[PDB]
Amino acid sequence: VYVYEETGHITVFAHDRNGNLSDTLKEDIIDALQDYRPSGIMLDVTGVEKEEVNVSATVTISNKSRIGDT
Amino acid sequence: VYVYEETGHITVFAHDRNGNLSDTLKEDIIDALQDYRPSGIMLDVTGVEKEEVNVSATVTISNKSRIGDT
Amino acid sequence: LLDQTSGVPSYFSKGADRLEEKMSLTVNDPTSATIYTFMDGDLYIQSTNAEMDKINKVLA
Numbered sequence: 001v002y003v004y005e006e007t008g009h010i011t012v013f014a015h016d017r018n019g020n021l022s023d024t025l026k027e028d029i030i031d032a033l034q035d036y037r038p039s040g041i042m043l044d045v046t047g048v049e050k051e052e053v054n055v056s057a058t059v060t061i062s063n064k065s066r067i068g069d070t
Numbered sequence: 071v072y073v074y075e076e077t078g079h080i081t082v083f084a085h086d087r088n089g090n091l092s093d094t095l096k097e098d099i100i101d102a103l104q105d106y107r108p109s110g111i112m113l114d115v116t117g118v119e120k121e122e123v124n125v126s127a128t129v130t131i132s133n134k135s136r137i138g139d140t
Numbered sequence: 141l142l143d144q145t146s147g148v149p150s151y152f153s154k155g156a157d158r159l160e161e162k163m164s165l166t167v168n169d170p171t172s173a174t175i176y177t178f179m180d181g182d183l184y185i186q187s188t189n190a191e192m193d194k195i196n197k198v199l200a
């Protein structure tokens with residue numbers, strides 16, 4: 001959980017193990033943070049800005065006979 | 071400390087035992103207030119309105135032998 | 141341009157933008173609206189009073 005503060009607004013970034021934020025989990029976080037937020041201040045919940053990094057690698061190997069799928 | 075309160079703004083007037091407020095002390099007060107201040111509301115720390123009364127007093131003494139530096 | 145009622149930066153302070161149209165003087169840009177014409181540093185044609193192209197075309 002990362003909490004970012006602005007004057008008159010609070011935004012909460014959350015994520016699961018996968019980096020995702022389901023709508024159901026978002027609703028749960030909102031309902032749990034109804035008791036927590038200050039009075040007269042606005043609270044918002046958003047997913048974490050996930051960044052999926054694609055990695056194509058070329059691995060040089062010594063033992064040519066051990067080259068295989070495993 | 072005198073906490074002066076406005077709509078959406080908080081002003082914390084603070085001073086040391088001399089009436090000053092050094093920048094290091096202001097930063098320390100700010101850091102200590104991070105845990106306590108409400109989230110989303112602006113907060114500012116400033117030094118008190120110190121007044122510096124010079125005094126010169128003419129005093130008469132009945133027993134004039136007692137006059138001196140003591 | 142922020143909200144005058146609050147008078148401080150905030151999440152709700154920002155609002156509409158403004159389109160600013162400043163005027164600048166040129167020398168020989170054809171796209172600009174010509175106001176004067178000169179020949180060897182001398183004024184070419186005068187106009188003592190208001191200029192109205194469509195009116196003047198009618199009057200001519």
